[PDB]
């Protein structure tokens, strides 16, 4: 079935709160249609920054990722479970992968901080806000359900699967 949800930016606390309704005044709203067993697809749809509040671009991106992580965390964890052993069979490989993604993410964040004037890095910043949001959202959902939240490394690893395929045999 379909789960609706809506995120609200609380500008003062600088936090998002989520509710399980579709509310068009919300800061990111939409649904997760859990149809994977029915059609072979889940369907996710997010409309963000179209509500009452007028929001900076970075917070629109954060809210969209927050909403997506909140709705799909259970499946984020299953997809990790399923693909982790397809790519990583030896702790030696895990070492190589952790080290690369850690250095890469640190390097990405430092450039975003440094190049605050640049249109290209500003858009890298939008993508990275969405990723922080996705991390923030999936955690919220985990805590609320009483599960151990996924780590940021696990989310980096999911988004990096393509880059990891050719990289790991190196």
Partner 1 sequence: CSALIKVLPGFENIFFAHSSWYTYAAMLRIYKHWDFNIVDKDTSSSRLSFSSYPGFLESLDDFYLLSSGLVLLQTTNSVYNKTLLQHVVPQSLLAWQRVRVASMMANNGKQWAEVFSKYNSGTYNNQYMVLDLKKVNLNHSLDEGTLYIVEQIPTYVEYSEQTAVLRRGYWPSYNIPFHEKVYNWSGYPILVKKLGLDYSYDLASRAKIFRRDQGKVTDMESMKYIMRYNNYKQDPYSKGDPCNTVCCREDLNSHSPSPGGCYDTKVADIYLASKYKAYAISGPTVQGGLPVFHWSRFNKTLHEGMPEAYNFDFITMKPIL
Ligand X SMILES: *[C@@H]1O[C@H](CO)[C@@H](O[C@@H]2O[C@H](CO)[C@@H](O)[C@H](O)[C@H]2NC(C)=O)[C@H](O)[C@H]1NC(C)=O
Tokens in use for 139? 């955690």
Nearer to ligand X, 37 or 148 (CB): 37
Measured from the CB atom, the residue of 32 and 135 that comes closer to ligand X is 32
Neighbour tally for 145: CB within 10 Å: 10
- Report CA-CA distances (Å) from 3 to 6, 7, 33, 35, 87: 10, 13, 6, 11, 31
- 96 belongs to the binding site for partner 1 (CB under 8 A): no
**Which of residues 10, 21, 36, 43 is near ligand X by CB under 6 A?**
43
Residue identified by tokens 């671009």 is 57
Residue 144 interacts with partner 1 (CB under 8 A)?
no
Do the Cβ atoms of 55 and 63 come closer than 8 Å?
yes
The whole-angstrom separation of Cα 109 and Cα 33 is 33
- Out of 6, 138, 141, 142, the only residue in the binding site for partner 1 (CB under 8 A) is 138
Q: Which of 35, 132, 46, 105 is nearest to 75 (CA)?
A: 35
The residue within the footprint of partner 1, chosen from 23, 47, 98, 153 (CB under 8 A), is: 47
1: which 2 tokens?
């079935």
Chain positions contacting partner 1, by CB under 8 A:
29-30, 32, 36-37, 39-50, 55, 57, 60-61, 64-65, 68-69, 72, 74-76, 78-83, 85-86, 99-104, 107-108, 119-120, 122-124, 126-127, 130-131, 134, 138, 155, 158-167, 170
Chain positions contacting ligand X, by CB under 6 A:
2, 31, 33, 35, 38-39, 43
């Amino acid at each position: 079935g379909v789960y609706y949800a809506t995120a609200y930016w609380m500008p003062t606390e600088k936090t998002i709160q989520v509710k399980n309704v579709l509310d068009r005044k919300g800061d990111a709203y939409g649904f997760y249609n859990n149809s994977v067993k029915t059609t072979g697809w889940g369907i996710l749809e997010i409309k963000a920054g179209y509500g009452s509040q007028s929001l900076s671009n970075e917070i629109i991106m954060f809210a969209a990722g927050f909403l997506e992580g909140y709705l799909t965390a259970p499946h984020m964890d299953d997809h990790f479970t399923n693909l982790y052993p397809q790519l990583i069979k030896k702790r030696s490989m895990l070492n190589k992968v952790q080290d690369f993604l850690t250095k890469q993410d640190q390097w990405t964040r430092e450039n975003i901080k440094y190049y605050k004037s640049d249109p290209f890095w500003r858009h890298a910043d939008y993508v990275m806000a969405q990723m922080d949001g996705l991390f923030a959202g999936a955690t919220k959902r985990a805590v609320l359900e009483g599960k151990k939240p996924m780590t940021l490394f696990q989310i980096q690893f999911l988004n990096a699967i393509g880059d990891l395929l050719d990289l790991i045999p190196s």
